[PDB]
Amino acid sequence: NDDDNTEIIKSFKNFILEFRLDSQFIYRDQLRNNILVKNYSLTVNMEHLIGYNEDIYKKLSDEPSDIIPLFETAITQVAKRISILSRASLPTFQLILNSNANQIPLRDLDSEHVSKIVRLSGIIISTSVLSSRATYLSIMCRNCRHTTSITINNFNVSLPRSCLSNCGPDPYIIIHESSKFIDQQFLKLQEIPELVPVGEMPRNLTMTCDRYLTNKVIPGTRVTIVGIYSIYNSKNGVAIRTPYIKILGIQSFTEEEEEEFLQLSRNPKLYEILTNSIAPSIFGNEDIKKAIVCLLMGGSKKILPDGMRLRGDINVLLLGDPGTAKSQLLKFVEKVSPIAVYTSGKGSSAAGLTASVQRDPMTREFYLEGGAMVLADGGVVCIDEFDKMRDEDRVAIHEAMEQQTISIAKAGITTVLNSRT
Amino acid sequence: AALPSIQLPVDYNNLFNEITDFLVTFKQDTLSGPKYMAMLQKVANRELNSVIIDLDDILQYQNEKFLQGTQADDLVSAIQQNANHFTELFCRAIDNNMPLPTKEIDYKDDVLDVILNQRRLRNERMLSDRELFPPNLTRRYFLYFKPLSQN
Amino acid sequence: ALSPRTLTAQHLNKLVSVEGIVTKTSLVRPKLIRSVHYAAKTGRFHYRDYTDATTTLTTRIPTPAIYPTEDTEGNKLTTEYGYSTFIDHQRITVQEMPEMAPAGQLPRSIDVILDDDLVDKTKPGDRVNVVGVFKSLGAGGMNQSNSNTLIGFKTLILGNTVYPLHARAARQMLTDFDIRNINKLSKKKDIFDILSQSLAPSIYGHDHIKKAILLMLMGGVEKNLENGSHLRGDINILMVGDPSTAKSQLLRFVLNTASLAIATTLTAAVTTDRETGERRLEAGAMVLADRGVVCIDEFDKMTDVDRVAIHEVMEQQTVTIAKAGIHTTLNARCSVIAAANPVFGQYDVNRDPHQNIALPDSLLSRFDLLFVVTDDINEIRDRSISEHVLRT
DNA sequence: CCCCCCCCCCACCCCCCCCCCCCCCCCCCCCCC
DNA sequence: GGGGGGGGGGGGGGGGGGGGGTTTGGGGGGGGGG
Ligand SMILES: Nc1ncnc2c1ncn2[C@@H]1O[C@H](COP(=O)(O)OP(=O)(O)NP(=O)(O)O)[C@@H](O)[C@H]1O
Numbered sequence A: 001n002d003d004d005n006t007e008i009i010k011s012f013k014n015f016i017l018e019f020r021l022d023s024q025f026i027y028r029d030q031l032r033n034n035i036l037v038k039n040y041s042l043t044v045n046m047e048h049l050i051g052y053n054e055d056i057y058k059k060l061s062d063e064p065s066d067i068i069p070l071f072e073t074a075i076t077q078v079a080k081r082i083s084i085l086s087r088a089s090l091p092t093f094q095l096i097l098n099s100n101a102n103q104i105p106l107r108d109l110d111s112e113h114v115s116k117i118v119r120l121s122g123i124i125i126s127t128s129v130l131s132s133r134a135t136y137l138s139i140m141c142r143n144c145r146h147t148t149s150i151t152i153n154n155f156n157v158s159l160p161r162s163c164l165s166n167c168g169p170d171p172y173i174i175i176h177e178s179s180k181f182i183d184q185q186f187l188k189l190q191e192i193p194e195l196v197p198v199g200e201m202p203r204n205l206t207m208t209c210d211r212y213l214t215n216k217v218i219p220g221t222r223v224t225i226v227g228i229y230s231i232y233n234s235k236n237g238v239a240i241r242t243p244y245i246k247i248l249g250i251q252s253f254t255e256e257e258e259e260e261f262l263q264l265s266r267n268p269k270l271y272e273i274l275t276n277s278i279a280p281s282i283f284g285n286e287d288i289k290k291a292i293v294c295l296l297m298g299g300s301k302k303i304l305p306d307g308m309r310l311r312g313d314i315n316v317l318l319l320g321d322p323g324t325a326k327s328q329l330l331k332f333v334e335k336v337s338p339i340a341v342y343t344s345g346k347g348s349s350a351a352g353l354t355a356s357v358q359r360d361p362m363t364r365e366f367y368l369e370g371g372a373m374v375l376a377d378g379g380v381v382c383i384d385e386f387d388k389m390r391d392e393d394r395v396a397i398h399e400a401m402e403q404q405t406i407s408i409a410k411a412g413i414t415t416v417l418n419s420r421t
Numbered sequence B: 001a002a003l004p005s006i007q008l009p010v011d012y013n014n015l016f017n018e019i020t021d022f023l024v025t026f027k028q029d030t031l032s033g034p035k036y037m038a039m040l041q042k043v044a045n046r047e048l049n050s051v052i053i054d055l056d057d058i059l060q061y062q063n064e065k066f067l068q069g070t071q072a073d074d075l076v077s078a079i080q081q082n083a084n085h086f087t088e089l090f091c092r093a094i095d096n097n098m099p100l101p102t103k104e105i106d107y108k109d110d111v112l113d114v115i116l117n118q119r120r121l122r123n124e125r126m127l128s129d130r131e132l133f134p135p136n137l138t139r140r141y142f143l144y145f146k147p148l149s150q151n
Numbered sequence C: 001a002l003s004p005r006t007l008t009a010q011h012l013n014k015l016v017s018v019e020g021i022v023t024k025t026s027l028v029r030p031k032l033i034r035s036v037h038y039a040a041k042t043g044r045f046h047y048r049d050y051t052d053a054t055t056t057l058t059t060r061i062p063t064p065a066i067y068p069t070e071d072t073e074g075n076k077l078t079t080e081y082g083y084s085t086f087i088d089h090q091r092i093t094v095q096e097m098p099e100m101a102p103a104g105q106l107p108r109s110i111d112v113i114l115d116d117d118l119v120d121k122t123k124p125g126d127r128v129n130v131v132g133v134f135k136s137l138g139a140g141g142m143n144q145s146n147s148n149t150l151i152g153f154k155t156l157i158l159g160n161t162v163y164p165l166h167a168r169a170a171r172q173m174l175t176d177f178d179i180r181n182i183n184k185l186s187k188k189k190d191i192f193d194i195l196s197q198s199l200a201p202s203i204y205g206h207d208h209i210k211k212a213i214l215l216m217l218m219g220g221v222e223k224n225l226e227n228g229s230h231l232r233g234d235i236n237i238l239m240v241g242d243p244s245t246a247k248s249q250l251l252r253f254v255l256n257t258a259s260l261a262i263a264t265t266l267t268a269a270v271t272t273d274r275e276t277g278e279r280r281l282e283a284g285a286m287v288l289a290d291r292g293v294v295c296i297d298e299f300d301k302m303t304d305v306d307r308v309a310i311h312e313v314m315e316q317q318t319v320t321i322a323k324a325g326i327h328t329t330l331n332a333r334c335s336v337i338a339a340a341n342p343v344f345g346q347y348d349v350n351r352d353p354h355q356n357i358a359l360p361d362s363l364l365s366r367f368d369l370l371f372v373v374t375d376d377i378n379e380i381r382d383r384s385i386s387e388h389v390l391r392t
Numbered sequence D: 001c002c003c004c005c006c007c008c009c010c011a012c013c014c015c016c017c018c019c020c021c022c023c024c025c026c027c028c029c030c031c032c033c
Numbered sequence E: 001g002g003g004g005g006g007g008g009g010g011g012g013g014g015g016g017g018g019g020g021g022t023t024t025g026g027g028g029g030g031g032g033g034g
């Protein structure tokens, strides 16, 4: 079937080389421009792949785990053909997908979607540290030192069971100098809160991304994911499998919003406009709204010659009578502020506020996970009904609120976290 | 599993000979039989089990030999460098040279005497054409090196 | 030039410099690299060298930690310590500098491996720059035991040097210029003003406080009477008062002026941790400051088991241990300066320190000098400190 | 006397083992003396 | 008519291959302060 794979590869090569709209070869341009800035990926809109030849899209969507590596390979070959004079070295290019297929909500994904390309959305609630996955393994036999290699496509390999021509039962080892690796990151996606069924607890998926999709999102961001709904046999029922998504695309200043915000800065009535625009259904409380605008913007953070650093963040306490719209103002600020977290004082614990220990079900090893203050870093933590908070929690607020740090010594993990809040 | 090997600046035959020479010769003569052989008579009487070696005694012996114009190969450095092996050498020298008891012991009351006597009798029954033990079994004393003083 | 964040899989097997902070320093362990064996009858000294993924910059077949005990001819082998070679080995976890970590992200960290003379170049909390080779190791779940192959490969830096970043004198040298000017100054009368006022020159007023600080730094002489009966010469001071007063800044100036000075914000203890299957006797700041000084900010916050034992520091200049059979007493012969805040509200100058702060009078009375300072609302002071803060 | 606090309790090599194969011994049968 | 030798079965040994080996939250009990 290698001739058939070669014809798939040549079909994709022709798609890169031939696809054109309104006199522009958009994917030749995008691939060249991506090479110039030294990001080795290509973002493909599958509307265009469908429009070019739907047979290719049918092959892709029938079995993406086999077809995606061939498309990546085709991109590498075209990349060389449009950036190197051959007869006078680049890595395996990442494919990135844009799509407008109808979204499957995160709760409805089940066994009939296994290995299909899927489009969904949710809130990223955690983002693991980066990790190294192999693309090319250089391999050696422990006894005879017969060397071979594994070239890997990360869509789901293992070391060979015995020597490929006594030589021992299980003999192969990796040569870590010649082997090539890539960045891999794990994310947890929670379903959109306004899509949760009545009385249900919100459900979530573990999911993975690599190369130029790592570090592209932070916790709390609302995203649409394109990826392969897929399976792996975890260590922790019977004949059961853990579901996960292999991400193929993410969607979450522009050169004219630059102009819009210059024009809005130039408006003389700006402060009144923003003041009116805070919680517009709440009548009155004019000075409080003005102060909320100040808290949103913040002062200016500073560093002195000594290395000492000075707070830019403003803290505001609204203490007062019932039904004065305090909670309504906090629940508005959690909407408008670009980073924000909302908690209530009686819902809190010191751990869930500063940071907590976790044991990752995937590695099965410890890692530290951020609480509300960390998730609010760079923005506002809205602590509603703050007077109901326990004393130890209010103690735990002090470092994160004034020193703007959290110092940690838990499970042997000594650590200090930042809390610009 | 084959092993490589290297030559090294030591010889345990020469040092074993040096150790037994020290043991059968030395006394604390600056304070005026050998200290160690007398102490081993105390061991033979079962009156003592803690055999203490002073590195200062070894040093005094080395200085006496060097004063008498022969090199002692600095046994102090060797025992300070690879001490564990020289426990075995010192104990073998003692086992090769310890004198017989003087005080009566009621020798048969030790099980080791009866069992090794029975093994010897059985071995003589064999030896008429019809080691006896691992030495740590018979070795009753405990041997310890005591460090150098300030000097 | 990197940090544990921007250190990336593209950098594997390259030589890298990482800017960071040390955490989780392992215990030092001796790592076997060559074993030497006298052959009992053969006479030869056989040997074996050893390999793992950390001892070599390049991959070689691992040699699995076994001493050989038999010759090719079957003769038994006796292992030779001292002639055998062991290297010190230590792991340290360098954390990213939290100042560099961007909005909403935890700090990344990586494990540096250090051998022999780089071991214990740093301790936990040290800001450091390490240079070494960034490496992968292990099977990464490619070995057929692991059904889960989403786990990444382990990675490390094999260290080639460790630069502590102490900068962005504990005993000083003395030149003839210093000897002359010290003695020439000592004959002047106002030295007790000038030297004390040279402490904390940014601080408005508080002359008597600075004089008392200087007397503590130049504290009194010990009295061992007959039968060795001990009476304490060291001096102890406590600054009660409002927050936002000179107190904490004075503790900074004292800490950076004194020598053998310990920062705190105590006594001694018998302690245990996650990996220890054993209990160890630990030194508090006064033991660490034996014949030195302790600086205790927020002293009103100290817990009961500490305060109960502070009496031994204050009376006997020592601390006694009374569990796990370690019944002993330790030298803790320091001169202490402490500072404290009201437990509720601004400080009520009518109430006693015993009443504005939860510390007992039977504890507060131990200190030789007991100051109460307050945020006076003087316009000249406020004008001065305000313009300093504005220029800042 | 009542309520709040805080304390407790709980969730890669080496050994054992088993399977497979080959040789040796012991019995039975037949022939020779 | 008994003993040796030939042939076949059954048991034991030896080798080879394989698999296994602490933090966070919650309720209830018990004790101390207003
Ligand atoms: N000034 C106002 N303008 C419009 N609606 C208001 C205003 N004040 C109160 N409300 C309404 O009354 C409610 C205020 O609720 P809420 O925000 O919880 O007040 P609150 O200050 O948090 N009181 P409490 O939760 O008891 O501390 C909402 O349903 C608002 O729509």
Ligand SMILES: [Mg+2]
Binding pocket: A326, A327, A328, A384, A385
């Ligand atoms: Mg409210």
Ligand SMILES: [Zn+2]
Binding pocket: A141, A142, A143, A144, A145, A146, A163, A164, A165, A167, A171
């Ligand atoms: Zn092989």
